Short mmCIF file of C-alpha atoms (C1' of nucleotides) in Angstrom, two decimals:
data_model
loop_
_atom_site.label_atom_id
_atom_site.label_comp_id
_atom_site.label_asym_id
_atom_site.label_seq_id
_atom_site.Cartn_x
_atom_site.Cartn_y
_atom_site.Cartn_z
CA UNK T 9 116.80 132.59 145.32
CA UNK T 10 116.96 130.87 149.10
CA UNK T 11 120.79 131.08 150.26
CA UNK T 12 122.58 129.23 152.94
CA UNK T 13 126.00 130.56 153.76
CA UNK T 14 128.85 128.46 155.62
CA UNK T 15 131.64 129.74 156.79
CA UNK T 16 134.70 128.49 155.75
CA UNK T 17 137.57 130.25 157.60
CA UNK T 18 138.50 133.43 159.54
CA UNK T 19 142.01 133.99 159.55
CA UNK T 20 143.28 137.18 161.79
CA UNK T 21 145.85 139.04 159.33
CA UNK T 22 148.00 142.12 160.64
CA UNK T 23 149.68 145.32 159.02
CA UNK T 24 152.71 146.54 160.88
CA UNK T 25 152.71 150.63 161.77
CA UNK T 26 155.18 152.46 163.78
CA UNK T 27 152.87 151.77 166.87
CA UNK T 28 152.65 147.93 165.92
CA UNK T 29 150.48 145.27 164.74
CA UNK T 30 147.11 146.27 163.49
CA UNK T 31 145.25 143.24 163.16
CA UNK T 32 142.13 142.54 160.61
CA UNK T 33 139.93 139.68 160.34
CA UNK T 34 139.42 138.14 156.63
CA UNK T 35 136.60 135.62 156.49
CA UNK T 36 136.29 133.58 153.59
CA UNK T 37 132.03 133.03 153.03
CA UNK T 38 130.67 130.11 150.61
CA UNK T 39 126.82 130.52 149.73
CA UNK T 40 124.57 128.68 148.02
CA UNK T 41 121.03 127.44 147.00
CA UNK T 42 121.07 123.66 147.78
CA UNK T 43 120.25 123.24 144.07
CA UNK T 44 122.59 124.33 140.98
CA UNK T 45 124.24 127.83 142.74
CA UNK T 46 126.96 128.32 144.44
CA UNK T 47 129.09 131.89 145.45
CA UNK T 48 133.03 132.54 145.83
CA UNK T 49 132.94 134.72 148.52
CA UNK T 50 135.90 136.95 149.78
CA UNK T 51 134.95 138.72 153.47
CA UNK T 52 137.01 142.46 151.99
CA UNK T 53 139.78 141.64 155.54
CA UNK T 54 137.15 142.90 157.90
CA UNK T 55 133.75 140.26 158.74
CA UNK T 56 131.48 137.45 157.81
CA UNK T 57 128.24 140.04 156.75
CA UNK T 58 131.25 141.67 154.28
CA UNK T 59 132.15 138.04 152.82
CA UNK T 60 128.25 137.22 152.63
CA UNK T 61 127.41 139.95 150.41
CA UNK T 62 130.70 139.43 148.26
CA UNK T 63 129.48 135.72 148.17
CA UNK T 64 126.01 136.51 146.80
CA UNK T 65 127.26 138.79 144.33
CA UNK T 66 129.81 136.17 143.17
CA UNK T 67 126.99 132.90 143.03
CA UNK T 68 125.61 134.73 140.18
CA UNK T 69 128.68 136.55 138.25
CA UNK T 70 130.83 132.88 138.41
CA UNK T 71 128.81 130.28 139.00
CA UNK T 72 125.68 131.30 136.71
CA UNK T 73 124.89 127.61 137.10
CA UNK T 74 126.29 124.40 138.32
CA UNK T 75 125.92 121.70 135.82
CA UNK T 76 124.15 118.10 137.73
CA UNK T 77 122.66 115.04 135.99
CA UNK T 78 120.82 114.21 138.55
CA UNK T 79 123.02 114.06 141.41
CA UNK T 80 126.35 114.49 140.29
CA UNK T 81 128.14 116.46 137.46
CA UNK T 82 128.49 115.66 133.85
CA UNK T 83 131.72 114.44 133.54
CA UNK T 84 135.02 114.40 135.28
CA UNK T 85 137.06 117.09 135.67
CA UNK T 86 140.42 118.78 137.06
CA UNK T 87 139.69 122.55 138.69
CA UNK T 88 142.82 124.28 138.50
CA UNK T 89 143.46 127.67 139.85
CA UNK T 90 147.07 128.95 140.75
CA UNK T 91 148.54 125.88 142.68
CA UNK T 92 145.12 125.40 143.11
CA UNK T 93 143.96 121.33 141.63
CA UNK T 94 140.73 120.03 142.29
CA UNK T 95 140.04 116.70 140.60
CA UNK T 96 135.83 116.26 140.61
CA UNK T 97 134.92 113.03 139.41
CA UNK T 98 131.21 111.91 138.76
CA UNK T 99 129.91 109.11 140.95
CA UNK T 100 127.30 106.61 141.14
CA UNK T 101 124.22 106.89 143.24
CA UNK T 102 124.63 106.60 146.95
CA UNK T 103 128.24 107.42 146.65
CA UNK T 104 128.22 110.70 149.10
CA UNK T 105 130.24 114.05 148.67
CA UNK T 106 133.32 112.57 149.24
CA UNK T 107 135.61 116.16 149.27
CA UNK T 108 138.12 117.89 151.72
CA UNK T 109 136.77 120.37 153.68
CA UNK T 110 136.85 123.61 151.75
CA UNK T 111 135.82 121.52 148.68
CA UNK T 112 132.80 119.87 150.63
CA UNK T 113 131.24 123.08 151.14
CA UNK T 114 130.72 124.50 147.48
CA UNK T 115 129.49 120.63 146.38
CA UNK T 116 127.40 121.01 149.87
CA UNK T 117 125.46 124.23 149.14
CA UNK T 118 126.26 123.78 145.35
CA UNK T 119 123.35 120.50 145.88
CA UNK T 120 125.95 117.99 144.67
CA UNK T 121 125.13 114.47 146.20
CA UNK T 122 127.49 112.41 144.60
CA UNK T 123 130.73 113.48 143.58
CA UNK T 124 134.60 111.73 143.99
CA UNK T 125 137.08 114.74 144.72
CA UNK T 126 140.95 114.65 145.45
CA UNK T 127 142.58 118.01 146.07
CA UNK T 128 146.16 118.11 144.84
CA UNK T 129 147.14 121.85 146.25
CA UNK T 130 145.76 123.44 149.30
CA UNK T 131 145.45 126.26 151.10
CA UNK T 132 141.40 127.98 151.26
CA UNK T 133 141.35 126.68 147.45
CA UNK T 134 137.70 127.34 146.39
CA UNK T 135 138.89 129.21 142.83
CA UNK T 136 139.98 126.19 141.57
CA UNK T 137 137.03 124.08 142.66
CA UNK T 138 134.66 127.27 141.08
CA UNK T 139 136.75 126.67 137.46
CA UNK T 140 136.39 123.34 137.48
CA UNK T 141 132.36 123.79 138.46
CA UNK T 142 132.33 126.29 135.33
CA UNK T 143 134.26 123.77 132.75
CA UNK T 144 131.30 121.48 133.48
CA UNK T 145 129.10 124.25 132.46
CA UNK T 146 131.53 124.32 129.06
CA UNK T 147 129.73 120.64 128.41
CA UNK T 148 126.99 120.92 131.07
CA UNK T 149 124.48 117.94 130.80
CA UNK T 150 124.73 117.11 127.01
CA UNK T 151 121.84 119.76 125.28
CA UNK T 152 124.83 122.55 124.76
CA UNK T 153 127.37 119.72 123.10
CA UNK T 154 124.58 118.63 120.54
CA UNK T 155 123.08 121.90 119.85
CA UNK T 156 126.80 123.37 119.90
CA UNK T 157 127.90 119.98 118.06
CA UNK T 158 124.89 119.81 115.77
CA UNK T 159 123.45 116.45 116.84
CA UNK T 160 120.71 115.02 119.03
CA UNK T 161 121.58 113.74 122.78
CA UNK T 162 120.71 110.06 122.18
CA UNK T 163 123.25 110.36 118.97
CA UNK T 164 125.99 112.17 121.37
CA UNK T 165 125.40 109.67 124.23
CA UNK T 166 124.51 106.07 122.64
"C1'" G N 1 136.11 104.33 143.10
"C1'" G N 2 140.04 108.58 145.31
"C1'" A N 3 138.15 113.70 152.03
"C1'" G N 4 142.29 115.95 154.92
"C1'" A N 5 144.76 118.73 159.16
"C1'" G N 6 148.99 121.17 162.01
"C1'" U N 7 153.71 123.44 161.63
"C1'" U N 8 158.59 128.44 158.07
"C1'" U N 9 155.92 134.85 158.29
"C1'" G N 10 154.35 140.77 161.68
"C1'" A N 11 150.90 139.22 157.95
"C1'" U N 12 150.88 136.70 152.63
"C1'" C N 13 150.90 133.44 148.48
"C1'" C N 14 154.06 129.58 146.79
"C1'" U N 15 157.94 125.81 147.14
"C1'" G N 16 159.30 122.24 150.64
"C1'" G N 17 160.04 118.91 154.30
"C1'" C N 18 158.31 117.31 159.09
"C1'" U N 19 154.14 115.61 162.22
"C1'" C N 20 149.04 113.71 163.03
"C1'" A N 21 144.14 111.24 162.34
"C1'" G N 22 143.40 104.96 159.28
"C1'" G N 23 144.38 99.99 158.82
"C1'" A N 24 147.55 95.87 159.83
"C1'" C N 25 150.85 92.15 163.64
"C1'" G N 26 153.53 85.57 165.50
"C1'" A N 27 154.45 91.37 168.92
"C1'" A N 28 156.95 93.06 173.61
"C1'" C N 29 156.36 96.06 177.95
"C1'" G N 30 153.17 98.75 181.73
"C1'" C N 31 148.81 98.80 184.64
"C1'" U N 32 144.56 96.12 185.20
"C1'" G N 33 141.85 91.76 184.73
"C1'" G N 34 135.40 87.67 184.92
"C1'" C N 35 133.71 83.73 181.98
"C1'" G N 36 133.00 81.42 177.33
"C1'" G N 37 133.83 79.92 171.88
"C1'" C N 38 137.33 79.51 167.54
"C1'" G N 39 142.36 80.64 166.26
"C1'" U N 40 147.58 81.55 167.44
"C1'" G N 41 152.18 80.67 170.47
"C1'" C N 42 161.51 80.21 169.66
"C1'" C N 43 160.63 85.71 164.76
"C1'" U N 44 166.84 85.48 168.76
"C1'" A N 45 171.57 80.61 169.06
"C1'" A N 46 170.47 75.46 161.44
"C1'" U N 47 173.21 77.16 169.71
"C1'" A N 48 174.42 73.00 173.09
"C1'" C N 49 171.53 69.44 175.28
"C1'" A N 50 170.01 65.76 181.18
"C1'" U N 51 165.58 62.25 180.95
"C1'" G N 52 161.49 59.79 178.65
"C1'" C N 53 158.73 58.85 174.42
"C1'" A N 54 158.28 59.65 168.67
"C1'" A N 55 158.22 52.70 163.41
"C1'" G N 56 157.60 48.90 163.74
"C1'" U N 57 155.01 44.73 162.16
"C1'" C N 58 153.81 39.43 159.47
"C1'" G N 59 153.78 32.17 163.57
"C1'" A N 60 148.75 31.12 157.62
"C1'" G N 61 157.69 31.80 155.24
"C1'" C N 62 160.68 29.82 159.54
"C1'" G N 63 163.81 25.33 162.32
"C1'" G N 64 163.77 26.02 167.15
"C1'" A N 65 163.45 26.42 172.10
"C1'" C N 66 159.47 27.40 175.84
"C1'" A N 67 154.34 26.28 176.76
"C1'" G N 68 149.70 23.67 175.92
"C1'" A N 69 146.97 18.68 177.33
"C1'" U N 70 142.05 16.71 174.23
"C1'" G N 71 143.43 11.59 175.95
"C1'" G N 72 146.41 7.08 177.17
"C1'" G N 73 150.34 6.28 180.69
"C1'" A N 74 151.59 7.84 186.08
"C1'" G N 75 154.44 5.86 191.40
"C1'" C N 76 150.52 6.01 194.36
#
RNA sequence: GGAGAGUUUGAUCCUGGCUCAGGACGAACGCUGGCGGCGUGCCUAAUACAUGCAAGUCGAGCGGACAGAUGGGAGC
């Protein structure tokens, strides 16, 4: 696959020694294809190239795909992780990612074009966006929920 | 049809307030100021008010004064 990383944040952290403050760098790395992939991304306290390769890795354990009829998920949805609570909501055409920052850059590289999202708990909160993004993928599209169901996709639908 | 951000720590996650970006107005005050077109203009003391003006009309209801003079009269 053809990834395109963003960079989310890069927070300086710090240990205390005897000597002082020894300081670290954590950057927090989303990647995706542009079209149904999308990585976590963690950045191991030390630089972007770290979080990259953690995020590439992680677009393919998580997110083995993200659900989209056409452009924009199957059906709404609350992501929650920790105080983590991501409400994605399917939209209509022309509609736009309308997301909060974090959130806008997994439905960004994740190819989502039209998608309502409120965050209700923040702080770097990509988990929760990523479970939410995999409970789609519980009743992606509609084939799983009539195979699973034992139906056709016109009878599930109308 | 629904976007967040900053700020408690050495650093953290959470809880939790605070603050900010938006829109609105009968606005006021600064500083500054060219014109035009629509709109708006006592929110305070239902406080007190100088002055003027804001409901008068019908003579085809009306007797009546006060006029009118078409003409005769009219001293000259």
């Amino acid at each position: 696959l053809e990834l395109e990383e963003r960079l989310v944040t890069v927070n300086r952290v710090a240990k205390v020694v005897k000597g002082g403050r020894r300081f670290r760098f954590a950057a927090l790395v989303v990647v995706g294809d542009k079209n149904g992939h999308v990585g976590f991304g963690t950045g191991k306290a030390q630089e972007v190239p770290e979080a990259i390769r953690k995020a590439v890795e992680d677009a393919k354990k998580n997110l083995i795909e993200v659900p989209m009829v056409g452009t924009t998920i199957p059906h709404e949805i609350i992501g929650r992780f920790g105080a983590g609570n991501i409400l994605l909501k399917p939209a209509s055409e022309g509609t736009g990612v309308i997301a909060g920052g974090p959130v806008r850059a997994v439905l960004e590289l994740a190819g989502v074009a039209d998608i309502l999202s409120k965050s209700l708990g923040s702080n770097t909160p990509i988990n929760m966006i990523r479970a939410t993004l995999q409970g789609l993928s519980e009743l992606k599209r509609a084939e799983d929920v009539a195979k699973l169901r034992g139906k056709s996709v016109e009878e599930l639908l109308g």
